A paper describes a structure:
Here, by deleting the branch-site adenosine (BS-A) or mutating the branch-site sequence of an actin pre-mRNA, we stall the assembly of spliceosomes in extracts from the yeast Saccharomyces cerevisiae directly before the A complex is formed. Our structure indicates that the U2–BS helix has formed in this pre-A complex, but is not yet clamped by the HEAT domain of the Hsh155 protein (Hsh155HEAT), which exhibits an open conformation. Thus, Prp5 proofreads the branch site indirectly, hindering spliceosome assembly if branch-site mutations prevent the remodelling of Hsh155HEAT.
To isolate a spliceosome assembly intermediate formed directly before the A complex that still contains Prp5, we carried out splicing in S. cerevisiae cell extracts with an actin (Act) pre-mRNA in which the BS-A is deleted. The proteins Prp5, Msl5 and Mud2 are also abundant, whereas Cus2 is absent, indicating that these complexes stall after Prp5 hydrolyses ATP, but before the tri-snRNP has docked. By fitting known X-ray structures of spliceosome components into the EM density map, together with protein crosslinking coupled with mass spectrometry (CXMS), we generated a three-dimensional (3D) model of the ΔBS-A complex. This complex consists of two major elongated domains—comprising the U1 and bipartite U2 snRNPs—that are connected by two main bridges. In the pre-A complex, U1 and U2 are connected by a second bridge comprising intron nucleotides upstream of the branch site. Thus, formation of the U2–BS helix alone does not appear to trigger closure of Hsh155HEAT. As the U2–BS helix has formed, but Hsh155HEAT still exhibits an open conformation and Prp5 is stably bound (see below), we conclude that ΔBS-A complexes are stalled at a pre-A-complex stage, after Prp5-mediated formation of the U2–BS helix, but during/before it carries out its proofreading function. Comparison of our pre-A complex with the previously published yeast A complex reveals that the transition from the pre-A to the A complex involves large-scale remodelling that requires displacement of Prp5. The repositioning of U1 and the U2 3′-region is essential to generate the binding platform needed to dock the U4/U6.U5 tri-snRNP during formation of the pre-B complex.
Residue numbers in the entry:
A (entry chain S): 2 to 93
B (entry chain Z): 2 to 84
C (entry chain P): 53 to 133, 144 to 305, 323 to 481
D (entry chain O): 160 to 971
E (entry chain Q): 125 to 213, 239 to 291
F (entry chain P): 882 to 890, 918 to 1265, 1292 to 1361
Amino acid sequence: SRHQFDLIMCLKQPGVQTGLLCEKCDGKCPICDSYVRPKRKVRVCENCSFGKQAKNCIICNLNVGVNDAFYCWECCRLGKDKDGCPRILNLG
Amino acid sequence: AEKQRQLKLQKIYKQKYIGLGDESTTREQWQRNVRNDTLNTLQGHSASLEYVSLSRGDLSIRDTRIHLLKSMSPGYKAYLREE
Amino acid sequence: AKDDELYLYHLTLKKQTNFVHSCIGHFVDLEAGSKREQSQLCVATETHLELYDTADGELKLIAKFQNLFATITSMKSLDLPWPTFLALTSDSGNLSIVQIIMHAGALRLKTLVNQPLTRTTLRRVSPISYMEIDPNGRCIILSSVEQNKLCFLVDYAQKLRISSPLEIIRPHMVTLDMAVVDVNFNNPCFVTLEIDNAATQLSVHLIFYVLELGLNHIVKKADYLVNPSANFVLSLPDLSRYNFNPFVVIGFENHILVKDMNGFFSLKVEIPKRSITNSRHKNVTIISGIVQKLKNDFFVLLQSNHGDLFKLTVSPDTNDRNRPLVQLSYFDTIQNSHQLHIFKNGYLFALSEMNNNFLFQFEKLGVEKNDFSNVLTSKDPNKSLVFEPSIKLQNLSILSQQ
Amino acid sequence: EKKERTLSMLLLKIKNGNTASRRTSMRILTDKAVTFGPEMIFNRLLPILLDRSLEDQERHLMIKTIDRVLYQLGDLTKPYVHKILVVAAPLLIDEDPMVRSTGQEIITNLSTVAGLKTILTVMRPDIENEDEYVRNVTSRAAAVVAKALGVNQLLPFINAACHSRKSWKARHTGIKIVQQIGILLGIGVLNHLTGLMSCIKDCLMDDHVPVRIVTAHTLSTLAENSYPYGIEVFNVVLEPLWKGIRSHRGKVLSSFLKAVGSMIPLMDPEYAGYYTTEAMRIIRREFDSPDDEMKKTILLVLQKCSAVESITPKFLREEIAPEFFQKFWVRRVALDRPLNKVVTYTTVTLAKKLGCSYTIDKLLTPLRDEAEPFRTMAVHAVTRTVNLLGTADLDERLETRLIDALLIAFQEQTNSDSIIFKGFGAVTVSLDIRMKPFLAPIVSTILNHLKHKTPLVRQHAADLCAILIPVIKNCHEFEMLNKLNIILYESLGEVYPEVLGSIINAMYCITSVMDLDKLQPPINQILPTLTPILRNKHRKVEVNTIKFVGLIGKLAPTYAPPKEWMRICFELLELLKSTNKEIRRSANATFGFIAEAIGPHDVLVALLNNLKVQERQLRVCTAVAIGIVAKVCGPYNVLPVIMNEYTTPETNVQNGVLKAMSFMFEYIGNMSKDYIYFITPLLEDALTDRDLVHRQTASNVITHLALNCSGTGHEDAFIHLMNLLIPNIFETSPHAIMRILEGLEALSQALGPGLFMNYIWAGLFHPAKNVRKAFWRVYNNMYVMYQDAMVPFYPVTPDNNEEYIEELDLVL
Amino acid sequence: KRRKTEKPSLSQLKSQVPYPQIIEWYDCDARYPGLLASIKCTKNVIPVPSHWQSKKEYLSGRSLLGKRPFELPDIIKKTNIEQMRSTLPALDLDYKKLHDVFFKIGANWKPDHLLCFGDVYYENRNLFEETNWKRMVDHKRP
Amino acid sequence: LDNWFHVHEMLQISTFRPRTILSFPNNPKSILFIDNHSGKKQCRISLQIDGECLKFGSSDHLYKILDDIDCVSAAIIDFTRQADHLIICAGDKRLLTYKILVNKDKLSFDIELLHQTEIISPIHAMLKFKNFLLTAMGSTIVLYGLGKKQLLRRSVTQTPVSITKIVSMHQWNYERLAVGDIHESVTLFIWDPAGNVFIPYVDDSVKRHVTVLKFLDEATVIGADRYGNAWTLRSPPECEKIMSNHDPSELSNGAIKYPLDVITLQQKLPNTYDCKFKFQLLNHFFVNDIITDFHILDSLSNSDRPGCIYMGLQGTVGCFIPLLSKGNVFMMGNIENIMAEADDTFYLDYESRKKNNICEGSCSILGRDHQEYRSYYAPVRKVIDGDLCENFLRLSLNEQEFLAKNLKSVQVEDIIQTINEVRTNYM
RNA sequence: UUACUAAGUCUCAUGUACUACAU
RNA sequence: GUGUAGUAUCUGUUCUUUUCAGUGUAACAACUGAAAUGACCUCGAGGCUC
């Protein structure tokens, strides 16, 4: 993540699925963790969804998220939107 | 830890986007990336492809496109030499 | 102080005319309450996009769609077991499947699903510039000029559904000329020509891929090394009458090959040549092949750099055995055309990368396979036929020019 | 080969260990399963997952390992088919959907490992299990094996082994496997529809009633899987399905009706009416079901028929409305939960076709009845019908009857029935302008429900008042405002937090509908009364109080002393970063109006003075307040005072300034373009400052500022800002290096690569082994974001490199 | 060893260069010196800021001690908040005033110094004296 | 809106592929065409004036054939006001002079070979200087006069080391020049009489591959790219003051007093600042085509605002209209800002309604943002793109009124007014 | 008329801030 | 107004085996290994010295 360093990402070709984030993490752009003017919903590779792990918050990787994560307009222009599958594999 | 992550992201970005100069990169390795991307865009835009077709004067345009594709590999020079 | 700051207002008065992509689908149903006909075409130049119909034997502007503000790097229609809507890939990497709809009093282009791929730019890693769709519309495949290839499995429902991408990554293999082979629903199979990026020698090797719907991944099948002179691949539909084993047509420069998937049959047929061979004479090539099949008769049209339009049919060679043969002949030719389509009607749309797109209806259909004079066979692969071009224009008849 | 047993310990390393250390075991076993022995490998892999200790992630790992082993040991999996079939069979019949999915995947992998003949020879002799559970498990196993090994690949063998007349066991197992395959495949039964109907039609006229019921169930499953279109194969048994509706007895007629309920919606428009008329002889006659299996089936069939477009609304009102109202529309199911749901759903589905007024004037009795059990279901169905149809089909007498029934249900709410609470708002919304003539009825109802002084009763009353507040108070009355405000501010100290939140919401709705001083509670009294309420730690209470304080300063921005508003803002500034995002949104929604009413200069000075206090654990939120107060007129009122706060010599203050500048820029996309030039002299001393902190946060300013201002034409200023950045590239530390990288990447968008390139190029290689490592980071990010963009800008000439490109010099 | 001693002389490298005066002694150890000379001496490239090879972390500057804390742009100084709030060791303002200062008054306004295409800020540099310099070449005439 | 033009023109294919197009300066419109042969090197010249073409002499043919002459580049020149000559540059590296004749009521074109001159370079670019041919070698710029039996070198100007080749170049009122490169960018020269040389007074900022180049003014330049960038540059006022207040003869040698910063940029950065000034980027734009021809028209169909219209290679014609006043570009800028993220606004509305109860690229149909696509190679600077705001016209009234609510400014109707104002009034 | 550059490492002391942790 | 552990930063102080070779470095630095002993001449320097 932008702040916590040891957090590792996925970075695969995103699928059709949309990543979920919990109400606790709601509002953060999964890359920069910004609250401003979100744009496009996150898309994750199928390898990050499958079973129960699909329900996890793509940000904090623990809680079960209801909400969809959106990229901000700064990351959508920086292109990090399309970089790959954001997810946090290690808890940190 | 942080730099150590930058190493892994160096491996991933290098894998996806092919040539990315890390620290020490030979001029042969890097110039090859230059040639590959320049040709890539010359053939990639139908615009510049149409342009090189006429300025070169080839009989067909796909000759220029597949020419650039072939020109991406180094051995294509010797290949032309053997014609 | 007055700020200079020149403020320019850009307008496109006339929109880009070099048509780089086309698709054969039937998009909108207009002026008719209930009608379904496969005869229609949508053609795209980068930004600019247009939709033409014929149905009269004469091409017609339908509507000039709004400016997309991107570089469309490939466009192919998809037909699924329904209104046929076109899959469109461009810069941003997004695979954008769009349906042309009638909204308010005009035809507007609606998008269904856009899938993010690579980044926003024209790139070599970008899985664009090479695209094709399963002729039965089960799956769409994008690839990159070099790095990687992605194939989505397309499914239709109350809402359209694009399956997760199927990745194959070959680091040093530069891909060129994606050509997908039709199937009977067995399994989708696509064919490419991979030129190695890092090598001591120039090596252009064809490779076959069978996507396995059962195992849900693309499988490398046959890697056949061919001369560096290779140009393109075309798909021979079945050869079900002669002897899952797809057969491809590899256009080289001065001759044509066809190759089996199992490598059992490799047929070399030397491409004929003009009589004049004016001044600078290249080994030429064939720029565009296409396939057509009707009444057990399937012929393909492959045009050289000079614009010479040729056909192939397959013969069993009943004397020896039942085995494929390859027979070239000569047609009306044309000017160099980037891509060729054929309606279910006898109309053949010739999209010229040079200047003008023009449509035909073929009647003579060309010379019969019986003549040994002007027709070449796979009997003797080493042979040459010289021919004088025909401006009399017997075979093909221009209907409409653009 | 005893080391393979240690591979099981390696499997523990795949379970107990690290992700890469766990995947390495699978990657190694993938290339070693062929040299491990199929017998011992299976004997060690199957019991490992067969034990109850197989967790969810453990089950997934074991399934992946078994799939890899099968992909490696394809022919070797044949002798072990008797093992997995005895293990994967129960797991496929588990309760959780994940367990059944994993079992089906394991069965499909085992089937694809060997051939179809092995699966046939394994599942065929397993039909001797007289237990119904074992027989169903074997049928599901065969269906899963056929769903992956090819439906027509096992269709002929199954049709040849089941078409005999051995006993009822095989005849039942055939239809069971057919239904299981149709349920597991799903929409993939289109091509194999007729191919399966040809073998399933042997039970439509079967002698044994059990075989007939199994065939009917299989036909219904196939029709549901292949629905809605494609009823061609359904015509192969459509005649018996339409004939035997009033021909079978008990279970036979039940199965026939269950199949017809699925076949009707998939049928055409012509034969649908005939099929409905032929099935009504046994459906409408037996509408009263002695048991639940018949009643639920009849309800589902009626719902499916109502969904079909064949039987129009006239036929339903003629032959379907009276029977459905007599045998079904009654309070006889006041306790059946499944029946209360099924009948309610069927009524809600049929009301849209038979007209809402046809049922709104016929269901005004079940809700007003003294039986609260059936009254709850009646109110639920009424609310569903009102939400589906709306308020068009509402007669005067029908509307009066509905209002009377709703009032009687709300007054006679002896239990905690939320159905009436949810339907009251829907009825009030359906009233619309008609609620004005019906004002005093609902007014007295709300008064009696509010003055009851009951906790749950007061909560429900406040909820219903807040739901129907804008419909009643906004009717241009100016008479009930005082009567509502006198009772609203009365119970202000409710100990129950939910009741307090409901009262706050009702007061907010009243203040939104009422004005100053049209509202009954005085503004000068409600403000100091609501002030301590915002200090509460309750989530919903504080969330409602924030919106109440915001709407208090809506139409009337005054109604307060400036000191009171300043104190309220200082108190709410600490809640701008709460855990619940709703409070964080409400705080920003209220602070905007608060600052617009108070004043720009006063709020700006207060926020600036607050920067030094409230040390950096919640200080940044105050900066957000600066950026939140500069959104009504833009950031042209906050920025000048910010720049002075930067003129202050204190480091921490300057840092808070620069970061506040970052955030105030990221919150404004199109605003900063005009403000950019006034920033650059401030970043002049920032980027030049010796402190890596100031250089860091200044770079963070350049990130957002450059991203949102890119392409505006300020590049000449961006050129400056960069010219100060380039020397900082060599600066170490993770925070500094990533902030500076992101800053330079933002500059790539505002300048374009070309100049940004020019720097990167003149530093691109270099001997220093350090300078090189540093700049190749920036060039890596540049190559990531841009490639074609950099193509023209490569400083490459024929003397620069050997091959160059021959096609760049072409000129036409 | 041999590669370190294989290096051509910098003056041997000068001849390959159209603008030989940019190349410096350390370019001898450039792993690809013939290439690095072409890039570094290419037309529009801007040589690396020279604060590298110094261990001072780019700012030890004695001049940094004597730098002014800040000065408001005179257009913003017109807004009078300088007197309203004392930054050196409440002030009611008008929305029209502030808005007009940035837009009506300050639309055409631009910082006086800025910098140029290849301007790079070395540690010892201070722009302010050069600002008074450029302004002075303007006002003062013989 | 879709067409804005009409095109006045068995299988028909001509062996001759056209090359360039020329027009006489003295005759207001007389258009001479030059083609090539695909085959043995051969050419044709077809002149048209007024309605249809011309005959050649008394012959039936309407065109002239030139055997063994191929044209790499060609331009027509009038050395004297009463005489008209044509200029060919052969791939043999030979400069061929011709003479044009109009028969006038016998009317026909008669071309006459005059001289033969050997050339060192291919001559990719040439144009009309006063009384002279102004041509560009690969490295250097030669100004040929009129000699007899062959044409003479009147003056030669050696280029700065940066320029490898000259693709195209253009002049401003014979005093000034803008010289383009393949690799590098435009560099402006000034003709100095009695110095008999062009002196470069300004460099360009970045590397840009310039296909075609023109002048709007004395101090500004239009240029396109091989890669599709349409840009316009301006000399800095620091340079304009110097050249307005000084004679060109003092630039090369003599006393010209440069501010302290310029010299410090000369010794500090001799490679970039060799030309001692720099073009501040003025306008930048990206049109995905490759612009062949710019033309600056003082008026487009009598319109006041002078436009510049360009034809691209892949084919296109488009215009850049300078906007008078400000609130023109303020309203236009706000409309472009609306239509830019309009697809995102639809996505956020469609998102909120899903929170209370259409993909992201709905309105754009493609993922590319406007600022991103049009920025591309280099960010658009002052140019606002009208081709976007034009899409606002097609959207339904519900969508348009949904978009314009973001403005406190005028209603959708006045929006459409301002949008449609450009084609009407500005051309 | 003086044409503009000095501290570094170690050692043993002094100057001043700070970070976890406990009453 | 305290204690436990620990950190950073000034300043003071001072120059570590004379050399060789390797690593290392942009060059330094730093690190790694060994060790001359004796005689003579001119003004710490110097030796085709033995």
